[PDB]
Amino acid sequence: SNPRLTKVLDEMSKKPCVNINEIRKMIRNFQPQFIQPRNGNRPNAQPRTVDSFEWVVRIQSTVETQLLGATNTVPQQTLNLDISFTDDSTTITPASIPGSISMLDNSRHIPAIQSMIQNFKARYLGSLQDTAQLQSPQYPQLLAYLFGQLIAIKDRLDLFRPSNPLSLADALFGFTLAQNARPRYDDHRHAKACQGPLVIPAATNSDCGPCGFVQINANQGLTLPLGACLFVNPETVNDQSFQDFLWLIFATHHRMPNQMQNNWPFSLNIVSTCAAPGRQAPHAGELTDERVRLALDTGHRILLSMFNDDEETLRYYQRKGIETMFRPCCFYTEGGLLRKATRYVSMVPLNGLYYYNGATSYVVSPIHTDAHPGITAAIESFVDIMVLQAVFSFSGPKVVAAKVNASQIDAAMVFGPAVAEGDGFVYDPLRPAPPLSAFYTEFIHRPAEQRIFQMAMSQIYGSHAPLIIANVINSIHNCKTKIVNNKLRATFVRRPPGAPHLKADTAIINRFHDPELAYALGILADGIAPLDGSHEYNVLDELDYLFNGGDIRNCFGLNALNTRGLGQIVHIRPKREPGKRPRRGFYTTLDGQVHPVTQDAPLDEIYHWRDHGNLTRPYSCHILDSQGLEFADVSNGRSRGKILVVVNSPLKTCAAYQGPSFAP
Amino acid sequence: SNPRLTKVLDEMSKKPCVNINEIRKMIRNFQPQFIQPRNGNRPNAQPRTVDSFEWVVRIQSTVETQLLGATNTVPQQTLNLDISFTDDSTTITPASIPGSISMLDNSRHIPAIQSMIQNFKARYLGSLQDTAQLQSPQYPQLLAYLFGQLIAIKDRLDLFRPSNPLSLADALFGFTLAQNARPRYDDHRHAKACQGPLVIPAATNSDCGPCGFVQINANQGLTLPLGACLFVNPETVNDQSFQDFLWLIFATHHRMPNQMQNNWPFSLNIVSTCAAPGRQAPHAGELTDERVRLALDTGHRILLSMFNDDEETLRYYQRKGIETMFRPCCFYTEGGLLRKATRYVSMVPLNGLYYYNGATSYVVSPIHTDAHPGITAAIESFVDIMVLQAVFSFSGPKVVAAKVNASQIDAAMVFGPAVAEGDGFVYDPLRPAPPLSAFYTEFIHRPAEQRIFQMAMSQIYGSHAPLIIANVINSIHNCKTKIVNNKLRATFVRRPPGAPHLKADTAIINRFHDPELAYALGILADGIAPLDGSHEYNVLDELDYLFNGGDIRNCFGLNALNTRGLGQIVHIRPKREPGKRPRRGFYTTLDGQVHPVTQDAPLDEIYHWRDHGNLTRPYSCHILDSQGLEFADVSNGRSRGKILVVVNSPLKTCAAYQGPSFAPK
Amino acid sequence: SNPRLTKVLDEMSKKPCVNINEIRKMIRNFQPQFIQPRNGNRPNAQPRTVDSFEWVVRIQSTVETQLLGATNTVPQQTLNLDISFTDDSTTITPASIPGSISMLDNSRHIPAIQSMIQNFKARYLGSLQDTAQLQSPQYPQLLAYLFGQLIAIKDRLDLFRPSNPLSLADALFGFTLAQNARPRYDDHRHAKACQGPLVIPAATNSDCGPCGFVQINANQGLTLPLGACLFVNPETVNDQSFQDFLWLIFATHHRMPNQMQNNWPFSLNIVSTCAAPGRQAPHAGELTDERVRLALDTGHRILLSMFNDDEETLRYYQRKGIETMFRPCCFYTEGGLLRKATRYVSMVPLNGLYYYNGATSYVVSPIHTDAHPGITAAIESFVDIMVLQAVFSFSGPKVVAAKVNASQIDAAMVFGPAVAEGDGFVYDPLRPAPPLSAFYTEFIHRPAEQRIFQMAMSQIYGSHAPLIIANVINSIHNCKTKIVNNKLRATFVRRPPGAPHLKADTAIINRFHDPELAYALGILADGIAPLDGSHEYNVLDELDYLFNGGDIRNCFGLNALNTRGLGQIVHIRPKREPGKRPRRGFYTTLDGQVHPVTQDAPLDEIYHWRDHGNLTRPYSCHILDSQGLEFADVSNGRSRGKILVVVNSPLKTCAAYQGPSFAP
């Protein structure tokens, strides 16, 4: 029955959204150019240890406009797309909704191991089907997350050359570290890595490395352990690469903080027909780069085999393991609201039965072979948040304010027609800041946003979308972040103490980054026009639409002339239309400051705003409402000019501007 | 609803423009007659290294007018075309628009590559059998651009034969160089080329000339690297010429400016099924003329196979690459800028999967073997700049003038007849000059200077039209060039950074070279009418057409007699209105002054314009306005005779005077 | 819609082409008569080593005509069908199109070996089906190619008795050869055989000869090697013939050039229940002819067993192995264009599982028992090239010329109506000669030629045609030969340095040999009449048809009288038909030499051409065009005589002249 939603769904159906594969393909070979700290500049020589948690790899992107039929030269602006580079956070949470985490079927694994046991004349108890079903289900999720974390550590330590590196393994096993010193790759305030050299478990009778080992003997009882069992052919257990991979995972799991080493035990047990090779813990430098590369390759082979040869869920989990190191930064004052609310992945302890006799599918382009896995992982997350922003900002800007007299009056007290009546919330500042979860949970579950978010995600991903939708719904439904009134200043990574209060104390909780990036990527874009090419503005009507609550970002003429004209091109005067009592026209800004307009004056003397060229804050919600105003031009018919805009971003993809929208 | 537009479209339909094949046929095979520095005379013997960035081959072409009735004979003029031939310039930009650059389709590279990677690949990495992960982007552009640059080097060395020669390979690599000295060629103030001797990269395990190498065998591993992969049979990889071609391409890629080198890395790397042939790294005198030529041939075959055997876009990118070192030189003192804003080709770092087994086609005459490709590329560019000229001028001269204390809100003042309302801007001089992309873009979007461009380019090039069109539009959008108060003096390559000054402080921004060449080549030409044969001229009316906002060039009845005795032929008097009021008349020149005329007087001392002969500035706007004039005759007849003009130029194409145009009848 | 093609298809359907079996049957017992060198004559005593790479076994065939009602005696001509005899080339290339190489199904092999392993209580890992599918597919192609090469070596060394032979094995194992000397059977410039005595691999623990050996033990682990596994019953591993055959193949594989010994490794592993017999490398003369014959027989038995008992694909590959020694020579000046472009066979490395407990099908007439396998192999190739020529010359002679002013003018510049407009190509001589592949690739893929070539091949071969069609399309699509302007002189085998330029510099790229052979064999013949029996010529109309571009080879009267009349039987005069201005009739030869005919003269004084009796070059393209000419006879009605022609070739088959054609 809703017309607007039907129109949007029809348009989305007619113009399909860009498949994820293009976005993956267009980043596999991207060479970063800037590794400066977010705030300052790179010092002469790199430090010896990753300490300043402010570094960022900057994907520069430039936009400059021109006023056709004029001699004005607007300075070029800069779409600063920042990727956090040294900062640790957690993306694991044991809390799932029904579709959040699935159970990979053990259809092709049980028969093979059954036949193996029968062939080697091992006396087992009970048909393996029911014992598999009840004793040990099949959740290999964890072992991919650790792999992603390892790749992320490698990438981080690679980009930031710490002036005398050792190896992937020498900075990971903590050789020559004081009992209180932190690992080289992660040494700064509020890190998330256990400190000191990691300690190998004691050498027991039978060991295939850092995990237990059980061999199957002809005419001999066989009993499985309690964790996960990975049957392998004897040709592999004696391989160097396999054991090196196993050791690397073990090391990565004993470095994550102490308290998650007792909730997600890294339990595994290799089973085969060899003689227990025993653990051979590498001690001195003996894991050269080529050996580590082989280890990673064999490891990915085993992982892909465990996932029923899916390579899509595996890629998703491997990525979700990486954001723990690489995150996409915000581009607004009150940021860290969307990313902080969509990061968690529901998980279950690792257990079940596996079988690997030989690889079957040859993944051409795995994650770990990309030019820089961190960037590739971060960009996919950026896409997720972009779509989420698109769905959220479907019916307004969703403001939240801190008015002291909050109880005395209800909502819609201050926000005129601009903020859709129903999306403005307030809270008195006497109490602590509310929980963002409260607002977002109510936002997501409305039918209008649900029925569109589902379609968008399905178009982007496909058969594998439902996992992502369920997981994001869970995460947003489970977030502890508060809407703190402070500001971020957009020149840091973590909120600095003593920062000033927000603008008008009104946080806006849709924005995460400019929609021009979404347009370029070819993904769903919110109701903002794409500043792409030639435009034909008309300052009068354009300006009039602004004072009805519209976003200034949709007004090209004003932004172009913000300080080069508009003091000699347009005037503002009260409306004298009827014969009734004359009234002083007034307009209300965001903070409820009713502004009167008595004597007609040049526009620049009535309203002001900073000139960011043509990249202004999208949803700034400048003018809530205005009544009784007229706009007359005082230039001899040169207020309807044309402008040109060029956006040569380096992350443009095939579907340049073919993505859907709301206001084409 | 535009009579002019429909008339021009119908005309262009009537007389189709000459497709480029005639231009190529004409220009392909003549050697230059004489090459000299633009300003001065060539020395006795050429120096060691090309070091003055003015040498330009020129192409003489003259006009002689002839008629009886004048006092003395008219001296002839020399309309000659020049080619820069030494100076360097960038041509590659990262910006893009929809049609600016397209990705080819790997519909005939995937079958073979998959069937060759499925068999010869250790039987423990699993069977691939998906033919869907092999979908990397196909952008084999930069290879052609580098190929073009290499051809340009060869041609530039050949034309300006230096005193002590060196093998093209030796000059390119530059073994016997200094620490940071310029290459043997391209050694002057504006030169932009990585100095120093070229450095071979490294001594790795898997080498196959300059680029990386990966093999696919049982006792090995396979991992396709990230850049481009050129899958070839073991037969050719062990060949000789192919290795030399790879070395040559690498060599020319490392002479680009260091920053641009970093932007677009040479990421080629080959994969095959045989042992890696170690890099050879030729030095001292390994490569020689014939071996280089053979390598060029095989390289062209490779590139053609990479392009899906298109050969029309291949030639396009090759031309654009060779254009960084050859280009037409402007002819008007204005400063020659129309070219500077049309020279950019969008690009993206090379990538994709390529398979090469055979030829699949044979092209009778590829660009790289046509007797100095530089000249043919330059003229192939000129034949497009002229079309752009024709389309812009479709309305009027489109002047841009300078006035002090101009309103910094709008810059559109009406100048009078002969200058339509849209054009004719103005700008304060004492502030930095405008950007000159704030006018062209506004020009080429209107649906009158767009459809004409569309159909003209369509007729010139045919199916492969859009690409050129799209690309040129992009060039206009982002061009940093600016209008300047200086002159080229007609004997320079760049403005002498001194104090040349404009005669009228204005600039006409839509003229690049005389339309006579456009007529001769058969391409579209506008406005100015052609002058090659007998003509009936009526001074008494042609002059009238002049003072109401014309240009002298159309008025070949005046230039003939400009100072041959036009004086005692026609008088100008204010007006003889037999009724209301005897007011006086005046005219306004391109400057502001409005000096008036009161009584009958000979014309020679009321206007008194400079006499070049029968080749005057076509868009100079000699007079803007005039009201109240009569132009009485002062001799029975003697103002209704005949005139014959002969112009012979060496580039007369096949269909020379059978092209479309819309000049006044 | 095309009428000519429909007519040809209808005629082909109505008159089936000759089955290949007749051609095979009519050569099994052919005794060659001439073994002279191509150019000169046999020396008194044969040399001691095969050095002159010019020898050829000549299949003489004679044709002589007679002029009924005349006293003239035309000398008999000679259809010199030459078979190259000592020259090495390569017919292997790792490049395949989709249908080029198939994968023989292992349907009847896996179950037998499965049952064997189960019976002998060997502990194997994993069901053998999937391991066969992924670990090792079933491509036995190579092992047949080596067999063909071995047979070819035997035949070559047999025909050319080198004055003191040793044995098949003594000239193959290189006993008593200097470390730089070449093998006796192949010692000449640009050979293709590795030199010096071949070296046996070191004697390891278990060996069944020159290849690894693995025995299956009760209650003992069994792991397969990486190459091909050939399970055999124990009764055979201890046989002498089997091991001798294995040794012979090993020797033949280590003699092919060095660089193809690292791309096609001869990997094999015998598996059985015997005790490893160990390698017993024959060292001194100990392989007598009867022992070698038994070896060859048992070897063919094993091969046929490996090929799922097909004997057709096996025969094809065995033949394709032989052309590496025996090839069919050209019969024109600019030859070595068709054969050089249709020789390659797409291949994959040898691997998979096999099983041979006992032969099942008794091939009555294998290749190696023919009178001379080389000749039989060469003739089948000759048939392939003959059909290919037939399809190519379906719409003209396909000329290629070297005109200096090639760029200035387009094609069809010189070739009048004779050369079908669309089949003439030119290239300036400044650049090197073009690649023949470019022209042939475009020729083959036209629908008109494809739809006829497919039918012809299917009729000739049958169910096994698609392999041959796909393989020839691949080969022609992959050829490195250039159209070199030089000439061959038809009295050599390899182009001699310093040979003179071609006639008019115009190579014709359809001809490989006279079509009379194709007619005799009963295979598809191009648009040339078969000179078989009584003919009723009419010199006037016949001559007129010539000057419209037709082929002189279709004009019997002219050829018969080329030098015995035509100076007193027919005159040429300009046509004075209308009242318009008289014009000098002219005709244009191949090289664009416009020839004027002003005053009527005897024919022999206006045009000339060499007299080859009645065997003239078929597609010589004598007269491109002529306009304004008349032909009047000056003999009292004896210009319409009859002629008789007799063609008693020794390779006539059952379908003497029943094959299809174009101009019956």
Residue numbers in the entry:
A (entry chain A), C (entry chain A): 37 to 700
B (entry chain B): 37 to 701
Sentences from the study reporting this entry:
Clinical Tv isolates are frequently found infected with one or more strain of the double-stranded RNA (dsRNA) Trichomonas vaginalis viruses (TVVs), belonging to the Trichomonasvirus genus within totiviruses. Here, we have determined the structure of TVV2 by cryo-electron microscopy (cryoEM) at 3.6 Å resolution and derived an atomic model of its capsid.
Like other totiviruses, the TVV2 viral capsid exhibits a T = 2* icosahedral capsid shell and measures ∼430 Å across at its widest near the I5 vertices, down to ∼350 Å at its narrowest between the icosahedral 2-fold (I2) symmetry axes. The TVV2 capsid is composed of 60 IAUs, organized into 12 decameric units centered about the I5 vertices, enclosing the viral genome. Within these decamers, five CSP-As are seated nearest the I5 vertex, crowding out five CSP-Bs which sit partially intercalated between the flanking CSP-As while extending between 5-fold axes to contact CSP-Bs from two other decamers forming the icosahedral 3-fold (I3) symmetry axes. The CSP-pair, A1B1, represents a reasonable initial species formed within the cytosol, as it buries the greatest surface area between subunits (∼1,540 Å2). Additionally, the interface between the possible tetrameric intermediate, A1B1-A3B3 (∼2,525 Å2), is ∼56% larger than the alternative A1B1-A2B2 tetramer (1,619 Å2) and ∼80% larger than the A1B2-A4B3 tetramer (∼1,405 Å2), suggesting that the first may be more stable and therefore more abundant in the cytosol. The protruding loop from the floor of the dimerization domain (residues 610 to 620) appears rich in positively charged residues (R612, R617, K616, R619, and R620) and inserts into a negatively charged pocket between the carapace and dimerization domains of tetramer subunits. This insertion may act as an anchor to stabilize the association of the capsid decamers through electrostatic interactions, protecting the viral genome in place of more robust interlocking strategies. The TVV2 capsid displays similar T = 2* symmetry but does not exhibit comparable subunit interactions and instead seems to rely on the abutting interface between the CSP conformers.
